[PDB]
Design an enzyme around this catalytic site. Sequence first.
Site, PDB file in Angstrom:
ATOM      1  N   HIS A   1      27.248  35.556  47.168  1.00 18.22           N
ATOM      2  CA  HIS A   1      28.205  34.852  46.052  1.00 18.22           C
ATOM      3  C   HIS A   1      27.747  34.371  44.884  1.00 18.22           C
ATOM      4  CE1 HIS A   1      32.558  32.895  46.172  1.00 18.22           C
ATOM      5  NE2 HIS A   1      32.068  32.986  45.143  1.00 18.22           N
TER       6      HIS A   1
ATOM      7  N   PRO B   1      38.467  50.857  43.854  1.00 11.68           N
ATOM      8  CA  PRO B   1      39.555  50.767  42.894  1.00 11.68           C
ATOM      9  C   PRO B   1      39.074  49.795  41.664  1.00 11.68           C
ATOM     10  CG  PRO B   1      40.326  50.676  45.189  1.00 11.68           C
ATOM     11  CD  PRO B   1      38.824  50.487  45.236  1.00 11.68           C
TER      12      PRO B   1
ATOM     13  N   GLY C   1      27.842  55.989  47.248  1.00  9.17           N
ATOM     14  CA  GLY C   1      28.605  56.965  47.457  1.00  9.17           C
ATOM     15  C   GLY C   1      30.327  56.964  47.800  1.00  9.17           C
ATOM     16  N   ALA C   2      30.716  55.792  47.735  1.00  7.16           N
ATOM     17  CA  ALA C   2      31.836  55.304  48.083  1.00  7.16           C
ATOM     18  C   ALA C   2      32.688  54.934  46.741  1.00  7.16           C
ATOM     19  CB  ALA C   2      32.154  54.064  48.999  1.00  7.16           C
TER      20      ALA C   2
ATOM     21  N   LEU D   1      41.096  48.083  39.554  1.00  6.95           N
ATOM     22  CA  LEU D   1      42.054  47.048  39.704  1.00  6.95           C
ATOM     23  C   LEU D   1      42.005  46.402  41.334  1.00  6.95           C
ATOM     24  CD1 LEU D   1      43.461  45.114  38.162  1.00  6.95           C
ATOM     25  CD2 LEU D   1      45.434  46.724  38.038  1.00  6.95           C
ATOM     26  N   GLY D   2      41.623  45.024  41.507  1.00  2.20           N
ATOM     27  CA  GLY D   2      41.870  44.534  42.719  1.00  2.20           C
ATOM     28  C   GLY D   2      42.743  43.173  42.259  1.00  2.20           C
ATOM     29  N   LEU D   3      42.895  42.515  43.265  1.00  2.00           N
ATOM     30  CA  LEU D   3      43.669  41.245  43.456  1.00  2.00           C
ATOM     31  C   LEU D   3      42.903  40.082  43.736  1.00  2.00           C
ATOM     32  CD1 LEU D   3      46.488  39.465  43.134  1.00  2.00           C
ATOM     33  CD2 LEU D   3      46.415  39.846  45.696  1.00  2.00           C
ATOM     34  N   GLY D   4      42.754  39.159  42.790  1.00  2.00           N
ATOM     35  CA  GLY D   4      41.990  37.914  43.294  1.00  2.00           C
ATOM     36  C   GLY D   4      42.485  36.704  44.087  1.00  2.00           C
TER      37      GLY D   4
ATOM     38  N   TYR E   1      36.862  30.243  49.811  1.00  2.00           N
ATOM     39  CA  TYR E   1      38.260  30.135  49.165  1.00  2.00           C
ATOM     40  C   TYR E   1      39.095  29.475  50.347  1.00  2.00           C
ATOM     41  CZ  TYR E   1      36.398  33.329  45.609  1.00  2.00           C
ATOM     42  OH  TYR E   1      35.800  33.794  44.587  1.00  2.00           O
TER      43      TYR E   1
ATOM     44  N   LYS F   1      32.290  37.545  50.455  1.00  2.00           N
ATOM     45  CA  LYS F   1      31.224  36.954  49.744  1.00  2.00           C
ATOM     46  C   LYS F   1      30.639  36.125  50.709  1.00  2.00           C
ATOM     47  CE  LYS F   1      33.832  37.183  45.280  1.00  2.00           C
ATOM     48  NZ  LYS F   1      35.121  36.601  45.749  1.00  2.00           N
TER      49      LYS F   1
ATOM     50  N   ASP G   1      39.879  40.806  46.580  1.00  2.00           N
ATOM     51  CA  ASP G   1      38.633  39.901  46.441  1.00  2.00           C
ATOM     52  C   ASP G   1      39.042  38.780  47.144  1.00  2.00           C
ATOM     53  OD1 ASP G   1      36.002  39.729  44.896  1.00  2.00           O
ATOM     54  OD2 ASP G   1      37.177  37.814  44.532  1.00  2.00           O
TER      55      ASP G   1
HETATM   56  N1  LIG Z   1      32.237  35.754  42.280  1.00  2.00           N
HETATM   57  C1  LIG Z   1      32.618  34.422  41.563  1.00  2.00           C
HETATM   58  O1  LIG Z   1      31.774  33.474  41.868  1.00  2.00           O
HETATM   59  C2  LIG Z   1      34.100  34.271  41.248  1.00  2.00           C
HETATM   60  C3  LIG Z   1      34.350  33.233  40.355  1.00  2.00           C
HETATM   61  C4  LIG Z   1      35.712  33.127  40.081  1.00  2.00           C
HETATM   62  C5  LIG Z   1      36.586  34.155  40.203  1.00  2.00           C
HETATM   63  N2  LIG Z   1      36.213  35.036  41.214  1.00  2.00           N
HETATM   64  C6  LIG Z   1      37.490  35.918  41.712  1.00  2.00           C
HETATM   65  O2  LIG Z   1      38.148  36.450  40.637  1.00  2.00           O
HETATM   66  C7  LIG Z   1      39.279  36.166  40.678  1.00  2.00           C
HETATM   67  C8  LIG Z   1      40.264  35.946  39.094  1.00  2.00           C
HETATM   68  O3  LIG Z   1      39.490  34.855  38.455  1.00  2.00           O
HETATM   69  P1  LIG Z   1      40.496  33.371  38.567  1.00  2.00           P
HETATM   70  O4  LIG Z   1      41.219  33.268  39.742  1.00  2.00           O
HETATM   71  O5  LIG Z   1      39.321  32.508  38.249  1.00  2.00           O
HETATM   72  O6  LIG Z   1      41.332  33.481  37.355  1.00  2.00           O
HETATM   73  P2  LIG Z   1      42.179  34.587  36.584  1.00  2.00           P
HETATM   74  O7  LIG Z   1      42.443  35.897  37.309  1.00  2.00           O
HETATM   75  O8  LIG Z   1      41.556  34.807  35.189  1.00  2.00           O
HETATM   76  O9  LIG Z   1      43.309  33.595  36.210  1.00  2.00           O
HETATM   77  C9  LIG Z   1      44.280  33.434  37.275  1.00  2.00           C
HETATM   78  C10 LIG Z   1      45.386  32.561  36.601  1.00  2.00           C
HETATM   79  O10 LIG Z   1      46.318  33.281  35.975  1.00  2.00           O
HETATM   80  C11 LIG Z   1      47.603  33.198  36.244  1.00  2.00           C
HETATM   81  N3  LIG Z   1      48.173  34.593  35.786  1.00  2.00           N
HETATM   82  C12 LIG Z   1      47.990  35.665  36.443  1.00  2.00           C
HETATM   83  N4  LIG Z   1      48.526  36.660  35.968  1.00  2.00           N
HETATM   84  C13 LIG Z   1      49.188  36.084  35.038  1.00  2.00           C
HETATM   85  C14 LIG Z   1      50.200  37.009  33.887  1.00  2.00           C
HETATM   86  N5  LIG Z   1      50.449  38.008  33.883  1.00  2.00           N
HETATM   87  N6  LIG Z   1      50.807  36.082  33.021  1.00  2.00           N
HETATM   88  C15 LIG Z   1      50.506  34.789  32.957  1.00  2.00           C
HETATM   89  N7  LIG Z   1      49.410  34.074  33.963  1.00  2.00           N
HETATM   90  C16 LIG Z   1      48.931  34.859  34.823  1.00  2.00           C
HETATM   91  C17 LIG Z   1      47.506  32.789  37.661  1.00  2.00           C
HETATM   92  O11 LIG Z   1      48.885  32.075  37.949  1.00  2.00           O
HETATM   93  P3  LIG Z   1      49.695  32.449  39.189  1.00  2.00           P
HETATM   94  O12 LIG Z   1      48.588  32.826  40.065  1.00  2.00           O
HETATM   95  O13 LIG Z   1      50.535  30.946  39.265  1.00  2.00           O
HETATM   96  O14 LIG Z   1      50.588  33.492  38.709  1.00  2.00           O
HETATM   97  C18 LIG Z   1      46.336  31.882  37.656  1.00  2.00           C
HETATM   98  O15 LIG Z   1      46.729  30.529  37.249  1.00  2.00           O
HETATM   99  C19 LIG Z   1      39.409  34.967  41.618  1.00  2.00           C
HETATM  100  O16 LIG Z   1      40.702  34.864  42.244  1.00  2.00           O
HETATM  101  C20 LIG Z   1      38.321  35.390  42.439  1.00  2.00           C
HETATM  102  O17 LIG Z   1      39.105  36.308  43.114  1.00  2.00           O
HETATM  103  C21 LIG Z   1      35.190  35.226  41.704  1.00  2.00           C
HETATM  104  O1  LIG Z   2      32.546  30.300  42.809  1.00  2.00           O
HETATM  105  C1  LIG Z   2      33.758  31.022  42.911  1.00  2.00           C
HETATM  106  O2  LIG Z   2      34.282  32.105  43.312  1.00  2.00           O
HETATM  107  C2  LIG Z   2      34.736  30.116  42.178  1.00  2.00           C
HETATM  108  O3  LIG Z   2      34.505  28.843  41.945  1.00  2.00           O
HETATM  109  C3  LIG Z   2      34.375  28.024  43.004  1.00  2.00           C
HETATM  110  C4  LIG Z   2      35.370  28.136  44.099  1.00  2.00           C
HETATM  111  C5  LIG Z   2      35.334  27.210  45.128  1.00  2.00           C
HETATM  112 CL1  LIG Z   2      36.491  27.416  46.413  1.00  2.00          CL
HETATM  113  C6  LIG Z   2      34.658  26.136  45.177  1.00  2.00           C
HETATM  114  C7  LIG Z   2      33.895  25.887  44.064  1.00  2.00           C
HETATM  115  C8  LIG Z   2      33.678  26.992  42.903  1.00  2.00           C
HETATM  116  C9  LIG Z   2      32.605  26.381  41.811  1.00  2.00           C
HETATM  117  O4  LIG Z   2      32.497  25.140  41.517  1.00  2.00           O
HETATM  118  N1  LIG Z   2      32.108  27.675  41.599  1.00  2.00           N
HETATM  119  C10 LIG Z   2      31.132  27.349  40.366  1.00  2.00           C
HETATM  120  C11 LIG Z   2      29.719  27.409  41.059  1.00  2.00           C
HETATM  121  C12 LIG Z   2      29.542  27.370  42.390  1.00  2.00           C
HETATM  122  C13 LIG Z   2      28.233  27.552  42.921  1.00  2.00           C
HETATM  123  C14 LIG Z   2      27.280  27.667  42.058  1.00  2.00           C
HETATM  124 BR1  LIG Z   2      25.360  27.853  42.732  1.00  2.00          BR
HETATM  125  C15 LIG Z   2      27.069  27.507  40.870  1.00  2.00           C
HETATM  126  C16 LIG Z   2      28.669  27.320  40.246  1.00  2.00           C
HETATM  127  F1  LIG Z   2      28.693  27.505  38.942  1.00  2.00           F
END
Ligand SMILES: NC(=O)c1ccc[n+]([C@@H]2O[C@H](COP(=O)([O-])OP(=O)(O)OC[C@H]3O[C@@H](n4cnc5c(N)ncnc54)[C@H](OP(=O)(O)O)[C@@H]3O)[C@@H](O)[C@H]2O)c1
Ligand SMILES: O=C(O)COc1cc(Cl)ccc1C(=O)NCc1ccc(Br)cc1F
Length: 316
Positions: free
Chosen positions: A111, A14, A10-11, A16-19, A49, A78, A44
Site C-alpha cells: 500500500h 479493467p 499476462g492478465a 475503470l474500477g470502483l474506489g 479502509y 493492499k 479497489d
Molecule cells: N493507494 C493509495 O494510497 C490510495 C489513496 C487514495 C485513494 N485510493 C483509492 O482510490 C479511490 C479514489 O480516490 P478517493 O476516494 O481519494 O477520491 P475520488 O475518487 O477522487 O473522489 C471521491 C469523492 O468524489 C465524489 N464523487 C464521485 N463521483 C462524483 C461525481 N460524478 N460527481 C461529483 N462528485 C463525485 C464522491 O462522493 P460520493 O461517494 O458521496 O458520491 C467522493 O466524495 C479510493 O476510494 C481508493 O480506492 C488509494
Molecule cells: O492510504 C490510502 O489509501 C488513503 O489514505 C488513508 C486511508 C486510511 Cl483508511 C487511513 C489513512 C490514510 C492516509 O493518511 N493516507 C496517507 C498516508 C498513509 C501512509 C503513509 Br506511510 C503516507 C501517507 F501519506
Amino acid sequence: MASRILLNNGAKMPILGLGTWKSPPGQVTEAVKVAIDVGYRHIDCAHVYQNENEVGVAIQEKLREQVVKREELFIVSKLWCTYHEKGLVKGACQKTLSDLKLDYLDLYLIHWPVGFKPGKEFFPLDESGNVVPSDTNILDTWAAMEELVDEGLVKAIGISNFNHLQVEMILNKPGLKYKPAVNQIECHPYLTQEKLIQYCQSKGIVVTAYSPLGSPDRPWAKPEDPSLLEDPRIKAIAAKHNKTTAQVLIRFPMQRNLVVIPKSVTPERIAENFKVFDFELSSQDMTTLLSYNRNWRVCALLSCTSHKDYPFHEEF
Ligand SMILES: NC(=O)c1ccc[n+]([C@@H]2O[C@H](COP(=O)([O-])OP(=O)(O)OC[C@H]3O[C@@H](n4cnc5c(N)ncnc54)[C@H](OP(=O)(O)O)[C@@H]3O)[C@@H](O)[C@H]2O)c1
Ligand SMILES: O=C(O)COc1cc(Cl)ccc1C(=O)NCc1ccc(Br)cc1F
C-alpha cells in the site's frame, strides 16, 4: 477505448474500477452491487479502509446471483504498513481474502513503501506523534509478496505510492522473481505525474490513478484547497463535450493509458462515472488538462514524513 489493459503477468485489468476508501460500511455493499449491475468489473479495496467485509458481501451476492463470473472480476487489495514483516504478509493477505469472500485476489499491492511497527494500531505513534517504523525494507517485503503468487493467493502483485527510485529499487532487486504489475499513485490535473508515469510505463508497469476527482471527501480537506470538480476551465471542457466534469476527470487518465478508480457511494454517480467509453478528449484537451498541474497532493501525511522510506521527499 478498449476496456482492459494487459499486465506484465499476462492478465487483463479493467481500466475503470470502483474506489472504496471512505465508503461507509452501511453503504458500500449497495454501492458495489450497483457498480457491478451497471458494468464495473474492478473494485479497489484495502484492509486499512475497514470495509472489506461489506465489499465482500456485495461481490459474493453478485457471484451467487450469476450477474458475473469470478473470472470476469478484477479485485484489488493492499498490504497495510503494519504488516511489512515476512511472518505477517500471508496472514494479512488471507484476512483480506476471507473478508472479501475470495479464494484469490487479482492484484495485491504494497500500500505504501513504508513499514510500521506491527500491532493493533494502523498508525503506531511515539509519544511525540511520529510513526514508529519497522526495520523491514521494501525488498524483503517484495519477496514476501512474490511468495503469495507462488502459493496461489494472488494472481498479480504490485506497489502503490512508490517513487521513481523505489520502483527502480524493486526492479533492481537481486534475484527478483516477479516484476511489479502496477504502481498505484495519486494522479489528476493538479498532480499530473508525467515523470513517474513515463518511467513506469517504459518498464511495462501499468499505472493506476487514484483520487482522480481530487478526493473531495478526504478527511483533512481545508476550505482553501483547489477543487477539480469546481474548476471552471475543466467545467468548460466538460460542457464542450456534453459530459460532466467528473466524466472528463475520469476519461483523462484513461487516454494516458492509465487505470482509474473513482470512488462513489451514490448510485447515480456510480453509473455516471462508468459512462466514459463513448466520447474522446482531443489532444489539445489532454495537453490543456495537463497544463493545470500544481504538484498538489491529496495524499500525504505529516506523521510519516520522517520514516526513512517516506516517498514524497524525492522529486518524482
Ligand atoms: N493507494 C493509495 O494510497 C490510495 C489513496 C487514495 C485513494 N485510493 C483509492 O482510490 C479511490 C479514489 O480516490 P478517493 O476516494 O481519494 O477520491 P475520488 O475518487 O477522487 O473522489 C471521491 C469523492 O468524489 C465524489 N464523487 C464521485 N463521483 C462524483 C461525481 N460524478 N460527481 C461529483 N462528485 C463525485 C464522491 O462522493 P460520493 O461517494 O458521496 O458520491 C467522493 O466524495 C479510493 O476510494 C481508493 O480506492 C488509494
Ligand atoms: O492510504 C490510502 O489509501 C488513503 O489514505 C488513508 C486511508 C486510511 Cl483508511 C487511513 C489513512 C490514510 C492516509 O493518511 N493516507 C496517507 C498516508 C498513509 C501512509 C503513509 Br506511510 C503516507 C501517507 F501519506
